[PDB]
Design a protein around this ligand. Sequence first.
Ligand SMILES: O=C(Nc1cc(-c2ccncc2)c[nH]c1=O)c1ccc(N2CCCCC2)cc1
Length: 255
Amino acid sequence: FQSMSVKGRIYSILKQIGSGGSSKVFQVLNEKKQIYAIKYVNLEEADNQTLDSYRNEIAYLNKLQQHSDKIIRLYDYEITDQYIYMVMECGNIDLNSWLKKKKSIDPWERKSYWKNMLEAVHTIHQHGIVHSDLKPANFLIVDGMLKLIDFGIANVGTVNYMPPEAIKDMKISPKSDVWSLGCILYYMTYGKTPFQQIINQISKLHAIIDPNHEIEFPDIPEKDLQDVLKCCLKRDPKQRISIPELLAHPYVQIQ
Ligand SMILES: O=C(Nc1cc(-c2ccncc2)c[nH]c1=O)c1ccc(N2CCCCC2)cc1
């Protein structure tokens, strides 16, 4: 019977979701048996840059809560020199586990999910945050609504969602998140990411950078959706569509 106290409130552990990185995620219940998700971070072996990365992520998460409901609720938090305890809202499943399980993907639910992501990523952009590591795992379904859980600020990993400008910078702008968001919608449309096919990562990273490598957009009934994908997957960030432009796109506005 494991428990935890956060700002003088007792939470009984229902079960553990995530682990590793010195961070554990738990489904918990308060005194009134209400569900919440608690993120625990151990700071015992964490360096100054890491601590400040964790302090920056919490500050933004807490500020940005008032600006969108597509951003995970942070109810409370405890921060000492030894740990972080984050009392957040509980979701049913993250988008990665959801997409992996689902065979069919309803065009209406795909559209609703797209709108949700755009609003969340748009909010963070307005406060000068560029995630730069967006993947389905960064989104949580919380009662048929997608919510952004991470801001890329704090510390198996895919390379399929990486923008060409991220590789070239060896340059990151809001446009980098548009590429990654485009890969999520490409996956929700074609059941794969634009460069999933390539096994050799050195060849895969070269393909994303190479403009001669043609991204395949098989014809679909939703002509609008196919345009969104072609606009997001433009290799030149200057020629790539912006998030305010995507919110004005027929695919999000016309039903
Ligand atoms: O990540 C999950 N949840 C939560 C994560 C966070 C969170 C916030 C900030 N930084 C990290 C995590 C907040 N609030 C949650 O609720 C999750 C739940 C169930 C699940 N699965 C069940 C079905 C089979 C498949 C597995 C899968 C995932």
